[PDB]
Design a protein around this nucleic acid. Structure first.
Length: 52
DNA sequence: GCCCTTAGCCCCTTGACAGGCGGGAAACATCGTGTTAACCTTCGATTAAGAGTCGCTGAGTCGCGACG
Protein backbone atom coordinates (compact mmCIF):
# COMPACT_ATOMS: atom_id res chain seq x y z
CA UNK A 1 0.00 0.00 0.00
CA UNK A 2 2.94 2.36 0.57
CA UNK A 3 4.17 1.43 -2.90
CA UNK A 4 0.74 2.39 -4.26
CA UNK A 5 0.91 5.67 -2.35
CA UNK A 6 4.43 6.28 -3.65
CA UNK A 7 3.26 5.63 -7.21
CA UNK A 8 0.51 8.20 -6.69
CA UNK A 9 3.05 10.65 -5.25
CA UNK A 10 5.35 9.99 -8.22
CA UNK A 11 2.51 10.73 -10.64
CA UNK A 12 1.78 13.95 -8.74
CA UNK A 13 5.47 14.93 -8.78
CA UNK A 14 5.69 14.23 -12.52
CA UNK A 15 2.61 16.38 -13.12
CA UNK A 16 3.96 19.18 -10.91
CA UNK A 17 7.62 19.22 -12.01
CA UNK A 18 6.72 20.23 -15.58
CA UNK A 19 5.50 23.62 -14.27
CA UNK A 20 8.14 24.40 -11.63
CA UNK A 21 11.68 24.59 -12.99
CA UNK A 22 14.42 22.51 -11.39
CA UNK A 23 17.07 25.26 -11.62
CA UNK A 24 17.03 27.44 -8.48
CA UNK A 25 14.02 25.62 -6.99
CA UNK A 26 13.20 25.30 -3.31
CA UNK A 27 14.13 21.79 -2.09
CA UNK A 28 11.31 19.21 -1.79
CA UNK A 29 8.81 21.87 -2.90
CA UNK A 30 7.03 19.69 -5.48
CA UNK A 31 6.89 16.40 -3.54
CA UNK A 32 3.54 15.93 -1.81
CA UNK A 33 2.85 14.23 1.52
CA UNK A 34 -0.95 13.78 1.54
CA UNK A 35 -1.19 10.48 -0.41
CA UNK A 36 1.86 9.16 1.47
CA UNK A 37 0.21 9.30 4.90
CA UNK A 38 -3.29 8.88 3.45
CA UNK A 39 -2.44 5.34 2.32
CA UNK A 40 -1.29 4.26 5.77
CA UNK A 41 -4.25 6.07 7.36
CA UNK A 42 -6.68 4.11 5.17
CA UNK A 43 -4.73 0.93 5.91
CA UNK A 44 -5.12 1.53 9.66
CA UNK A 45 -8.47 3.34 9.51
CA UNK A 46 -10.89 1.20 7.51
CA UNK A 47 -8.88 -1.70 6.05
CA UNK A 48 -10.31 -5.20 6.30
CA UNK A 49 -7.00 -6.45 7.73
CA UNK A 50 -6.84 -3.66 10.34
CA UNK A 51 -10.53 -3.98 11.23
CA UNK A 52 -10.10 -4.91 14.90
C1' DG B 1 -84.52 41.90 66.05
C1' DC B 2 -84.06 45.36 62.19
C1' DC B 3 -82.08 49.58 60.14
C1' DC B 4 -78.27 52.87 59.70
C1' DT B 5 -73.34 53.90 59.31
C1' DT B 6 -68.68 52.91 58.24
C1' DA B 7 -64.68 49.73 56.82
C1' DG B 8 -62.61 46.33 53.64
C1' DC B 9 -62.43 44.03 49.05
C1' DC B 10 -63.22 44.16 44.17
C1' DC B 11 -63.34 46.64 40.22
C1' DC B 12 -62.34 50.64 36.93
C1' DT B 13 -59.08 54.68 34.78
C1' DT B 14 -54.22 56.44 33.69
C1' DG B 15 -49.79 55.79 33.09
C1' DA B 16 -44.43 55.90 33.03
C1' DC B 17 -42.00 53.13 31.60
C1' DA B 18 -38.79 48.47 28.82
C1' DG B 19 -37.77 46.29 25.43
C1' DG B 20 -38.73 43.96 21.72
C1' DC B 21 -40.01 41.84 16.61
C1' DG B 22 -38.81 44.05 12.65
C1' DG B 23 -37.87 46.96 8.26
C1' DG B 24 -34.48 50.44 6.97
C1' DA B 25 -30.08 52.32 6.53
C1' DA B 26 -25.63 51.22 6.45
C1' DA B 27 -20.91 48.82 6.97
C1' DC B 28 -19.05 44.42 5.53
C1' DA B 29 -18.32 39.27 4.11
C1' DT B 30 -20.21 36.27 -0.31
C1' DC B 31 -20.87 34.28 -5.43
C1' DG B 32 -21.29 34.32 -10.04
C1' DT B 33 -18.85 35.99 -13.63
C1' DG B 34 -14.96 37.29 -16.24
C1' DT B 35 -9.38 37.73 -17.71
C1' DT B 36 -3.59 35.96 -18.68
C1' DA B 37 -1.93 34.47 -23.40
C1' DA B 38 6.24 32.24 -23.76
C1' DC B 39 6.97 24.55 -23.49
C1' DC B 40 3.92 18.13 -23.04
C1' DT B 41 -2.73 17.85 -27.91
C1' DT B 42 -4.90 9.58 -25.03
C1' DC B 43 -5.47 9.55 -17.74
C1' DG B 44 -6.31 4.96 -15.85
C1' DA B 45 -8.20 -0.57 -12.71
C1' DT B 46 -9.40 -4.84 -12.05
C1' DT B 47 -12.15 -8.55 -11.74
C1' DA B 48 -10.24 -13.06 -12.89
C1' DA B 49 -9.29 -19.62 -6.94
C1' DG B 50 -18.06 -21.73 -5.54
C1' DA B 51 -22.72 -21.80 -7.76
C1' DG B 52 -28.09 -22.74 -10.11
C1' DT B 53 -30.03 -20.55 -14.33
C1' DC B 54 -32.61 -16.07 -17.89
C1' DG B 55 -31.50 -13.01 -22.85
C1' DC B 56 -29.28 -12.80 -27.48
C1' DT B 57 -25.52 -13.91 -31.48
C1' DG B 58 -22.90 -16.79 -35.27
C1' DA B 59 -20.47 -21.50 -37.49
C1' DG B 60 -20.95 -26.38 -40.10
C1' DT B 61 -24.00 -29.94 -41.48
C1' DC B 62 -28.29 -31.34 -44.37
C1' DG B 63 -32.83 -30.75 -48.42
C1' DC B 64 -34.99 -28.76 -53.58
C1' DG B 65 -33.63 -28.49 -58.24
C1' DA B 66 -31.17 -27.10 -63.17
C1' DC B 67 -27.96 -27.08 -66.48
C1' DG B 68 -24.36 -30.34 -69.11
Amino acid sequence: QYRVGLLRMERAIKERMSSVDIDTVMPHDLINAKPAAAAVREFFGSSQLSQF
